[PDB]
């Protein structure tokens, strides 16, 4: 029964929500470390015709 | 890395908000899911490391330890669910909270890109373990054990902190990457000798070293089943991880300073293996076996060769799993018998055959039977020590002989012979205990198929 | 006899933990055992003042 | 003992919280505007 | 520690008595007015370490 | 006493401390100290009994002697330089006398004897005020003249204070004596970094004040003054015992609790000035404080002591008077380690 | 530094030592405190008058007044202590022990 | 399939590590420089830090003092 | 670094005017989130001590706790950032004004530097 | 000696409770049969079915980020080049000595 | 004060055994007198004669302990022909501890004193060699 089992089974959504939030926060921290994107001597590359960044 | 930390933090709200009769199910399910998530860290590179951010990074030495730490929590919950049956909901939730906090601290400790953060989490892991030992313990000596398990650790760890900050004043950075890339040789000086000692003894006390192993039998005996599991499986490996991380700056002074600890470990392995032979307690015998294995790991780390490090990593993983299984089996016997003495209950193979099979497999994997990863680590360390010096083989072989002797002694005393007549409360083993044994043993025999997953960064 | 009782249970216990416990207990007893007479504390303060004046200059 | 929810205290608490939040948002907006002005961003 | 309420408010609660050369009643000079005056103008704003050396 | 009289005396104490803090003249600092001491005595003797009177007279004797030597040091400094401003002390004989006076005012060793006696004699609220508020003025004066202190004497007194507190706290069954020895040890930690960084001194003062406020308020809530009386607290308010154990672990310097923040930073600072032996000795000595904190925690919450039959009646009543700032104090004294860099605010 | 200042400091130190001797008679502790105050007043007055610090003439009297107030307080306390025991002997205050 | 749906390319980690190393190296050099600056300022006192107060010279009264020689 | 005597310092100013030239901390700063979490924990402890339903006793009281903690944390973060900016500014200015005490090291490659080798045996 | 020989009023030590007596098929998880059975089911499904199987298959088929086959192919092509060119396989010096500047002794 | 420190330190380690022994005896006597004064102030045992006997006993023990340490350290340094070696200080300190135990007449006390002041003397020698500062001035 909806709106009844939710009051008892709503705790099961906490961990997956934490997981997706952690993935979002990992991307959050990743976005701040692009000072050398497409600048290392090993992977100096010319951009593709429809490409703006090598990795996101 | 937050994809693992955040679910572990959300495990707390879930437990507290959980129904009064649904805490164990939710905790076990979500802990297993978090272990599945953490399984992704095994995909390492032959290059430097998995640098997620400025605060956390992963490595093929940290990855197996993290996987084992995430895997241990469901087993700990399954083991603890039995003896906490007559316990109030608030205090059961507090127990689960302590377990979750310990897992979170260990997970953050094993990444620890900076050494001061590593020290902070490495000493933060102390509080939940002390609370678990001194609160949910049976005997009156638990308090004493807790005191020991505390002060020994601090007696080694307080100087380390000083050394750590001193290094940051000289080097300018305690980040592991900068420390590795900018490492400089240590001049053979008294000041450098004392800095070496301050950096080393903090991790040597927790392995533990043979001289400083007194706290371990007390802490393991008086702690509950979950406390014994977490102490034997993961908490002992913190010293080895710290030593492997910190020995980079200690060269070349390590060559001269390794001699006392090498001698102490090489003789204390024999001493503890012989002590195991004359023991009237199962938990104490398992604790002394753990001491012997960690002494071998200390020898491996001090030898400081690639094969040494590979064998050390494999041995830590294998020993953690094996000791957790042995403690679980001993606790299953104790819950029926309530005496914790080897000679009291005998001939249990007649009454509990499947549990006897579990006992046999645990004893065999503790005996370092090939091609188990226990044997892989032991053989790698033995070969590295033989390359270090050809005379170590005598002590190593003696240790193997005594190890086999006491393992089969433990098996035969409790499983073989005639049953005790006056004991009649030996009920058939439950599905929970058998599932616990299977979940402990299957990963070992699966990891022996892919050894490179647990051989560390020097593979 | 040697491995279990002599070393593990007695001498290793005697050296690090028991000696520390005994020394700390003795020092705590010596320091805390003051009868509460301000005469002795004041004489000690005078001695300390004299030592500070005659030693730290 | 036997008492009803004190609506005076509840109203004071809600008003204090709302006023603090409004002041914080206004202060933040002013700070960003001032910093942009001094540093010549926009 | 030192909360300079006087300098914040310009009250001058006790600065009038701090030195000999600060507005004595009836313009009565200190015995060492000139030396104190010279030493004070020597060390004004220079800072304690540099003033000492 | 009359509540108006008590409020006036408390405001007089605070005004004396503020006068010490905001004045730039030595005579005004001495006057503020005199006012604080004058208004402190009736607060200590709020509950009339011979013990309170004895504690108050011991406190009066010690503080009067400290003020008198402070005045002598001021006079000698004026003699060797016609200066009344609080600055570098000029004379070295007047700087050693200025240090012992402030040490007896703070309670540092070897002038530590009066602290356990006075704390045990007075009640819990008077002990709270004495151990928290009475440290602001001498520490402020020391911070102002920090560059003039001889490091040898100050460091010797700090190390002696730490040793004496750690050793003397082991033998105590009374909670007030335990708190007094803890205060002595924390003052020893506080003054060991004055020659190097006063900001660390003020940070340690703030953390110690928060922890002491939380501890003393918890002791007031569970009205117990002995170990055995505190052992009965689990049977009525177990959450109070749990919070008390967490706070005690915090005062032991155990990470990741708040009490680890000062020590750590102090050690860090003292490693910048090529000092190694002293911080190591300080940590090894603070192990003793942690030991007796852990013994108290054992007797308090980690074990369930036997109770009494009459306790059942206490189950039917609730505390009429409640303390508003206790939860905030507990949280600040337990969970502010991640906020360490905020110490750059020159607290 | 002339000999007069040295002798005054010596008198102050002797009074402090007598205060710290504590043979008996807490009244003698109060008397030693008052002697220390008298030595301080004498030294401060001599120093201030010698250097013609005109405003600092406020300093001695203030000190005097404050100290006398302190003395009064102490006297009151002593009376109360005596009011419990009947004598002002120091050794009677042994209920509190470290 | 696993590499496509779970893991990013090799360059990502390479350049992220390069940036992290650059940041940490700057932090280390700044720490040494700050320590040296602190030492120099405390020793000499000419710097903005460690400025201990002295007597304000605006308090001096510049007027005839009933005696020609001050 | 003792900035008590730094020239041109207003005595009792929490945040000087020049601090307005620095970027303010974001409203989503993790430190502000931690301060709000501390306020929430204080509210939970307040509910627990007074023997009330911990999670759902006073919503207004808990929300006031969180709001006050966030307010004080924001202003504290502002002051902390200003102080660190001042420290870096002073250090850079002192380095610039004293070139003789901070010489430019000669750049040498590892191919021309002889470092002793210690074999592991 | 009128003492009751009882140190204090204490509850008697309770006997152990058997999960099998009140409920066969007890599974050793809980005293409530439905919660017990569901606990067993979720333990078996998330331990043996999800982690032990899917995780093992995931680890078995992890991509070659360790660069084993890449190193093998590089060595294959490098040996093919050196053998054809007559070069003496792997050189003794890991770096070209021409770009290493020794410090002249002149002793 | 530091006059005794200067007198003890100025003498070379490898020469003048008697002067080093005299300086160490003076330092030990001063330390024992200080300990006796502290004990008398904190605990007046029974009388003036008992107090002066206690002070004499403590002073002789400490002076005695010091004398044994100085003679042994200097002799070991001279015969071993290797000055500035903490092993000589360890030997001298532990011999002094053995003499202290003999005075106290306790085997366990003697062994503990030997160990715990041999280590202390070795640490002091190491600090003198490497320039460790117990009371560091404010560098920064
Ligand atoms: C040999 C070829 C195998 C091919 C078939 C595949 C078999 C897969 C089995 C995997 C392991 C089993 C899981 C462990 C828990 C046991 C389960 C259980 O409870 O039994 C209930 C079940 C029902 O019994 P029940 O009647 O209801 O209960 C009565 C009581 O329980 C009374 O019980 P009991 O009296 O009947 O005793 C149970 C029995 C079985 O229980 C056990 O003790 C299992 C322990 C096995 C190993 C012990 C640890 C040592 C480390 C070895 C690690 C290697 C693992 C390799 C990868 C494994 C992948 C998971 O114990 C033994 O017989 C003693 C075994 C000792 C053998 C020592 C030799 C070891 C090295 C052998 C070579 C391995 C690599 C070969 C490489 C070169 C060739 C290619 O019994 C069984 O299923 C028996 C299992 C079959 C025997 C397996 C023993 C050899 C297998 C070695 C590992 C796999 C090798 C892979 C390829 C080799 C080629
Ligand atoms: C790395 C950081 C990350 C982790 C953070 C960890 C800390 C965080 C929390 C800090 C404190 C705040 C909360 C604690 C308040 C205490 C209240 C309490 O006792 O619990 C009862 C209460 C339930 O009981 P009740 O029905 O109200 O009535 C029972 C009475 O309260 C009382 O019943 P009783 O009196 O009959 O029971 C007696 C019992 C009761 O006594 C207690 O339980 C006292 C509480 C513990 C003391 C707390 C000290 C302050 C925090 C220190 C944390 C230390 C961290 C460092 C690690 C070392 C660990 C020590 O005492 C004993 O049994 C004596 C022996 C206990 C064993 C020895 C003491 C060890 C305790 C140490 C615990 C430390 C961690 C606490 C974790 C939270 C526990 C609630 O629990 C709760 O419901 C509140 C828990 C939290 C609420 C979660 C709601 C959030 C979910 C929705 C939002 C979703 C979030 C994500 C957003 C996005 C989603 C879409
Ligand atoms: C108790 C259970 C185990 C706990 C842990 C025990 C392990 C810790 C032991 C630490 C290792 C030894 C410490 C110093 C070793 C240095 C090598 C030395 O032994 O060799 C000679 C050193 O000579 C002598 O040993 C001098 C030192 C003698 C004083 C030490 C006391 C000896 C026994 C005390 C043991 C107590 C240790 C535990 C204390 C709590 C070489 O002479 P020299 O070439 O000139 O010196 C070379 C070093 N330099 C270059 C820096 C100068
Ligand atoms: C235990 C945790 C800390 C809690 C602290 C109490 C929190 C509530 C306090 C409420 C606000 C108090 C701030 C006062 C308002 C204006 C202050 C301003 O006028 O003063 C300025 C200075 O502001 C204050 O000093 C800053 C106080 C902020 C304290 C927070 C630091 C906490 C340490 C890090 C732990 C993290 C705690 C986070 C949660 C609270 C000017 O100082 P100045 O006259 O020029 O020199 C005197 C100081 N000297 C001598 C050291 C240089
Ligand atoms: C009951 C009696 C038996 C009945 C059943 C009969 C059937 C017998 C078959 C079972 C064993 C016989 C041996 C047959 C082995 C064949 C499978 C093997 O080849 O696969 C292995 C694969 O095994 C895995 O690699 C090892 C298992 C993963 C270990 C992770 C454990 C699971 C996570 C749980 C938590 C971890 C806890 C411990 C922390 C570390 C090795 O594969 P590999 O040659 O290399 O390359 C794979 C293919 N490539 C080339 C495309 C890449
Ligand atoms: C410089 C000073 C260094 C101080 C070092 C402090 C070490 C930390 C342990 C302090 C314990 C001191 C207290 C003590 O031992 O008291 C004796 C006490 C008596 O029991 P009580 O519960 O107090 O009362 C029973 C009667 N009703 O004995 C005990 O129970 C002790 C049991 C646990 C001992 C803890 C383990 C300590 C040893 C571990 C290593 C630490 C050694 C110190 C550093 C070594 C040097 C590097
Ligand atoms: C389970 C218990 C284990 C206890 C572990 C204790 C062993 C660690 C060593 C003792 C503590 C030393 C901490 C030093 C921290 C490192 C800092 C450092 O090494 O810097 C040195 C400082 O070195 C020291 O000062 C060390 C002096 C030791 C003082 C404390 C002694 C403690 C006991 C020593 C005897 C025990 C020795 C072996 C203990 C093994 C444990 C059993 C350089 O000093 P500077 O003045 O800066 O140099 C300038 C000139 N080049």
Curated annotation (Swiss-Prot), chain F:
Record localization: Mitochondrion inner membrane
Origin: domain of life: Eukaryota
A GO cellular-component term linked to this record: respiratory chain complex I
GO biological process, one term: mitochondrial respiratory chain complex I assembly
Record key words, sorted: Electron transport, Membrane, Mitochondrion, Mitochondrion inner membrane, NAD, Respiratory chain, Translocase, Transmembrane, Transmembrane helix, Transport, Ubiquinone
Keyword Translocase: yes
Gene Ontology molecular function, alphabetical: NADH dehydrogenase (ubiquinone) activity
Ranges annotated as spanning the membrane: 3-23, 25-45, 59-79, 89-109, 149-169, 178-198, 200-220, 237-257, 274-294, 325-345
Membrane topology: Multi-pass membrane protein
Disulfide bonds: none
The enzyme's E.C. designation: 7.1.1.2
Catalytic activity: a ubiquinone + NADH + 5 H(+)(in) = a ubiquinol + NAD(+) + 4 H(+)(out)
Residue ranges that the Swiss-Prot or TrEMBL entry lists as coiled coil: none
Enzyme class, UniProt record, top EC level: translocase
UniProt main location, coarse: mitochondrion
Family: Belongs to the complex I subunit 2 family.
Subunit structure: Core subunit of respiratory chain NADH dehydrogenase (Complex I) which is composed of 45 different subunits. Interacts with TMEM242.
Function noted in UniProt: Core subunit of the mitochondrial membrane respiratory chain NADH dehydrogenase (Complex I) which catalyzes electron transfer from NADH through the respiratory chain, using ubiquinone as an electron acceptor. Essential for the catalytic activity and assembly of complex I.
Protein name as catalogued: NADH-ubiquinone oxidoreductase chain 2
High-level lineage: Eukaryota, Metazoa, Chordata, Craniata, Vertebrata
Gene that encodes the chain: MT-ND2
UniProtKB/Swiss-Prot annotation, chain G:
Cellular component aspect of the GO annotation: mitochondrial inner membrane; respiratory chain complex I
Domain of life of the source: Eukaryota
Intracellular or extracellular location(s): Mitochondrion inner membrane
Listed Gene3D superfamilies: 1.10.287.3510
Transmembrane segments: 1-21, 29-49, 61-81
This protein's UniProt keywords: Electron transport, Membrane, Mitochondrion, Mitochondrion inner membrane, NAD, Respiratory chain, Translocase, Transmembrane, Transmembrane helix, Transport, Ubiquinone
Topology within the bilayer: Multi-pass membrane protein
InterPro entries membership: NADH_UbQ_OxRdtase_chain4L/K, NUOK/Mnh_C1-like
Reactions mediated catalytically: a ubiquinone + NADH + 5 H(+)(in) = a ubiquinol + NAD(+) + 4 H(+)(out)
Listed GO MF terms: NADH dehydrogenase (ubiquinone) activity
UniProt record, GO biological process: ATP synthesis coupled electron transport
EC number: 7.1.1.2
Subunit organization: Core subunit of respiratory chain NADH dehydrogenase (Complex I) which is composed of 45 different subunits.
Protein task: Core subunit of the mitochondrial membrane respiratory chain NADH dehydrogenase (Complex I) which catalyzes electron transfer from NADH through the respiratory chain, using ubiquinone as an electron acceptor. Part of the enzyme membrane arm which is embedded in the lipid bilayer and involved in proton translocation.
Annotated family: Belongs to the complex I subunit 4L family.
Descriptive protein name: NADH-ubiquinone oxidoreductase chain 4L
Lineage: Eukaryota, Metazoa, Chordata, Craniata, Vertebrata
């Amino acid at each position: 029964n909806v709106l009844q089992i939710v009051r008892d089974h709503w705790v099961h959504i906490l961990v997956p929500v934490g997981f997706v939030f952690g993935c979002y926060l990992d991307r959050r921290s990743d976005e701040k470390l692009t000072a050398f994107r497409n600048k290392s001597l090993l992977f100096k590359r010319e951009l593709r015709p429809n490409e703006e960044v090598t990795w996101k | 890395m937050l994809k693992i930390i955040i679910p572990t933090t959300m495990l707390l709200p879930m437990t507290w908000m959980s129904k009064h009769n649904m805490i164990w199910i939710n905790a076990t399910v979500h802990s297993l899911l978090i272990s599945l998530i953490s399984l992704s860290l095994l995909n390492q590179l032959g290059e430097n490391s998995l640098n997620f951010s400025l605060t956390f990074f992963s490595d093929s030495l940290s990855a197996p330890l993290l996987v084992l730490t995430t895997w241990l929590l469901p087993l700990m919950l399954m083991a603890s669910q039995s003896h906490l049956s007559k316990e109030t909901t608030t205090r059961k939730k507090l127990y689960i909270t302590m377990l979750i906090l310990l897992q979170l601290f260990l997970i953050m400790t094993f990444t620890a890109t900076e050494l001061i953060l590593f020290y902070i989490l490495f000493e933060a892991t102390l509080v939940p373990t002390l609370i678990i030992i001194t609160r949910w313990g049976n005997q009156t000596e638990r308090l004493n054990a807790g005191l020991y398990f505390l002060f020994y650790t601090l007696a080694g760890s307080l100087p380390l902190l000083v050394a750590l900050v001193y290094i940051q004043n000289t080097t300018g950075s305690l980040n592991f990457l900068i420390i590795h890339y900018w490492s400089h040789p240590l001049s053979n000086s008294w000041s450098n000798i004392f800095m070496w000692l301050a950096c080393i003894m903090a991790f040597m006390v927790k392995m533990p070293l043979y001289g400083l192993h007194l706290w371990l039998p007390k802490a393991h005996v008086e702690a509950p089943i979950a406390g014994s599991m977490v102490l034997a499986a993961v908490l002992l490996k913190l010293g080895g991880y710290g030593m492997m991380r910190i020995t980079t700056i200690l060269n070349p002074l390590t060559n001269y300073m390794a001699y006392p600890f090498l001698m102490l470990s090489m003789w204390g392995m024999i001493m503890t293996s012989s002590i195991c032979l004359r023991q009237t307690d199962l938990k104490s015998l398992i604790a002394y076996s753990s001491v012997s294995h960690m002494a071998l790991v200390i020898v491996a780390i001090m030898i400081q060769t690639p094969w040494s490090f590979m064998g050390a990593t494999a041995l830590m993983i294998a020993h953690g799993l094996t000791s957790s299984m042995l403690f679980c089996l001993a606790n299953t016997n104790y819950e029926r018998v309530h005496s914790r003495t080897m000679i009291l209950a005998r001939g249990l193979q007649t009454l509990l055959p499947l549990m006897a099979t579990w006992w046999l497999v645990a004893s065999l994997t503790n005996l370092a039977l090939p091609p188990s990863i226990n044997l892989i680590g032991e053989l790698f360390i033995i070969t590295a020590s033989f390359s270090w010096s050809n005379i170590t083989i005598i002590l190593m072989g003696m240790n193997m002989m005594i190890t086999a002797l006491y393992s089969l002694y433990m098996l035969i005393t409790t499983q073989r012979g005639k049953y005790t007549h006056h004991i009649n409360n030996i009920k058939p083993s439950f599905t929970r205990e058998n599932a616990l044994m299977a979940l402990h043993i299957l990963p070992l025999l699966l990891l022996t198929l892919n050894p490179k997953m647990i051989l560390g960064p020097l593979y | 006899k040697s491995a279990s009782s002599l070393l593990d249970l007695i001498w290793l216990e005697t050296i690090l933990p028991k000696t520390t416990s005994f020394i700390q207990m003795k020092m705590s007893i010596m320091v805390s055992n003051q009868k509460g007479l301000i005469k002795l504390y004041f004489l000690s303060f005078l001695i300390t003042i004299m030592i500070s004046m005659t030693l730290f200059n | 003992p036997h008492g009803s929810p004190d609506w005076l205290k509840v109203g004071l608490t809600l008003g204090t919280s709302v006023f603090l939040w409004i002041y914080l948002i206004k202060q933040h907006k002013e700070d960003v505007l001032e910093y942009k002005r001094r540093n010549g961003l926009e | 520690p030192f909360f300079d309420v006087q300098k914040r408010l310009g009250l001058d609660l006790d600065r009038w008595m701090t030195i000999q050369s600060a507005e004595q009643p009836h313009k009565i000079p200190g015995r060492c007015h000139a030396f104190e005056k010279e030493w004070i103008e020597c060390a004004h704003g220079i800072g304690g370490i540099r003033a000492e050396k | 006493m009359n509540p108006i009289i008590y409020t006036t005396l408390i405001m007089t104490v605070m005004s004396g401390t503020m006068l010490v803090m905001i004045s730039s003249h030595w005579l005004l600092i001495w006057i503020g100290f005199e006012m604080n001491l004058l208004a402190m005595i009736p607060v200590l003797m709020k509950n009339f009994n011979p013990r309170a009177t004895e504690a108050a007279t011991k406190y009066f004797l010690t503080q009067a002697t400290a003020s008198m030597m402070l005045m002598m040091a001021i006079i000698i400094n004026l003699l060797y330089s016609g200066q009344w401003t609080i600055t570098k002390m000029f004379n070295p004989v007047a700087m050693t006398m200025m240090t012992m006076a402030l040490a007896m005012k703070l309670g540092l060793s070897p002038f530590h004897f009066w602290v356990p006696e006075v704390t045990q004699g007075i009640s819990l609220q008077a002990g709270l005020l004495l151990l928290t508020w009475q440290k602001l003025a001498p520490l402020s004066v020391l911070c102002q003249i920090s560059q003039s202190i001889n490091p040898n004497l100050m460091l010797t007194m700090a190390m002696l204070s730490i040793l004496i507190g750690g050793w003397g706290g082991l033998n105590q069954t009374q909670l007030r004596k335990i708190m007094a020895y803890s205060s002595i040890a924390h003052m020893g930690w506080m003054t060991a970094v004055l020659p190097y960084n006063t900001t660390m001194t003020i940070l340690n003062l703030l953390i110690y004040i928060t922890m002491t406020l939380a501890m003393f308020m918890l002791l007031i809530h569970s009205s117990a003054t002995t170990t055995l009386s505190l052992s009965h607290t689990w049977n009525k308010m177990p959450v109070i015992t749990s919070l008390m154990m967490v706070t005690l672990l915090s005062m032991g310097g155990l990470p990741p609790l708040s009490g680890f923040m000062p020590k750590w930073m102090i050690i860090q600072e003292m490693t910048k000035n090529e000092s190694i032996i002293m911080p190591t000795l300080m940590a090894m000595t603070a192990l003793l404080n942690l030991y007796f904190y852990m013994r108290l925690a054992y007797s308090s919450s980690l074990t369930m002591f036997p109770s009494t039959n009459n306790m059942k009646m206490k189950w039917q009543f609730e505390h009429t008077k409640q303390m508003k700032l206790l939860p905030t104090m507990i949280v600040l004294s337990t969970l502010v380690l991640p906020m360490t860099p905020a110490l750059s605010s020159l607290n | 530094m002339p000999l007069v200042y040295m002798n005054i400091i010596m008198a102050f130190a002797i009074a402090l030592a007598g205060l710290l001797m504590y043979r008996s008679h807490l009244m003698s502790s109060l008397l030693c405190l008052e002697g220390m105050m008298l030595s301080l007043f004498i030294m401060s007055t001599l120093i201030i008058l010698n250097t013609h610090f005109t405003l600092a003439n406020m300093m001695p009297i203030i000190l005097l007044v404050f100290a006398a107030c302190e003395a009064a307080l102490g006297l009151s306390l002593l009376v109360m202590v005596s009011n419990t025991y009947g004598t002002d002997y120091v050794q009677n205050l042994n209920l509190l022990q470290c | 399939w696993i590499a496509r749906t779970f893991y990013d390319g090799p360059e990502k980690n390479y350049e992220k590590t390069m940036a992290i190393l650059q940041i940490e190296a700057e932090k280390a050099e700044l720490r040494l420089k700050e320590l040296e600056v602190r030492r120099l300022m405390r020793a000499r006192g000419d710097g903005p830090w460690y400025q201990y107060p002295t007597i304000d010279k605006a308090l001096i009264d510049h007027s005839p003092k009933t005696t020609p020689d001050n | 670094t003792m900035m008590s005597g730094r020239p041109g310092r207003v005595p009792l100013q929490f945040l000087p005017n020049e601090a307005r030239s620095l970027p303010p901390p974001k409203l989503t700063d993790p430190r502000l989130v931690y301060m709000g979490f501390l306020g929430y924990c204080s509210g939970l402890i307040d509910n627990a001590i007074r023997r009330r339903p911990v999670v759902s006793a006073g919503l207004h009281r808990q929300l006031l706790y969180v709001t006050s903690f966030v307010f004080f944390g924001y202003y504290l973060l502002k002051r902390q950032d200003y102080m660190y900016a001042l420290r870096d500014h002073d250090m850079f200015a002192y380095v610039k004004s004293h070139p003789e005490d901070f010489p430019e090291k000669d750049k040498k490659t590892y191919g021309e530097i002889l470092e002793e080798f210690h074999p592991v045996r | 000696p009128p003492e009751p020989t009882i140190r204090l009023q204490e509850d008697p030590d309770p006997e152990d409770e058997n999960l099998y007596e009140k409920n066969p098929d007890s599974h050793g998880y809980d005293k409530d049969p439905i919660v017990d059975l569901w606990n067993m089911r979720v333990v078996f499904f998330f331990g043996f079915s999800i982690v032990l199987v899917l995780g093992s298959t995931f680890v078995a088929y992890l991509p070659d980020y360790r660069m084993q086959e890449w190193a093998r192919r590089e060595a294959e092509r490098l040996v093919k080049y050196r053998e054809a060119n007559g070069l003496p396989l792997m050189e003794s010096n890991c770096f070209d000595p021409n770009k290493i500047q020794l410090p002249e002794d002149e002793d | 004060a530091k006059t005794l420190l200067h007198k003890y330190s100025d003498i070379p380690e490898g020469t003048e055994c008697h002067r080093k022994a005299y300086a160490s005896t003076s330092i030990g006597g001063a330390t024992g007198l200080i300990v006796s004064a502290y004990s008398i102030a904190l605990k007046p045992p029974a009388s003036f004669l008992e107090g002066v006997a206690r002070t004499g006993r403590y002073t002789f023990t400490s002076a005695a302990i010091g004398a044994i340490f100085g003679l042994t350290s200097c002799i070991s340094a001279q015969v071993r022909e290797k000055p500035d070696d903490p092993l000589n200080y360890f030997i001298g300190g532990c011999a002094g501890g053995l003499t202290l135990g003999a005075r106290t007449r306790s085997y366990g006390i003697g062994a503990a004193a030997c160990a715990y002041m041999g280590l202390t003397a070795a640490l002091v020698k190491m600090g003198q060699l490497e320039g460790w500062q117990v009371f560091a001035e404010p560098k920064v």
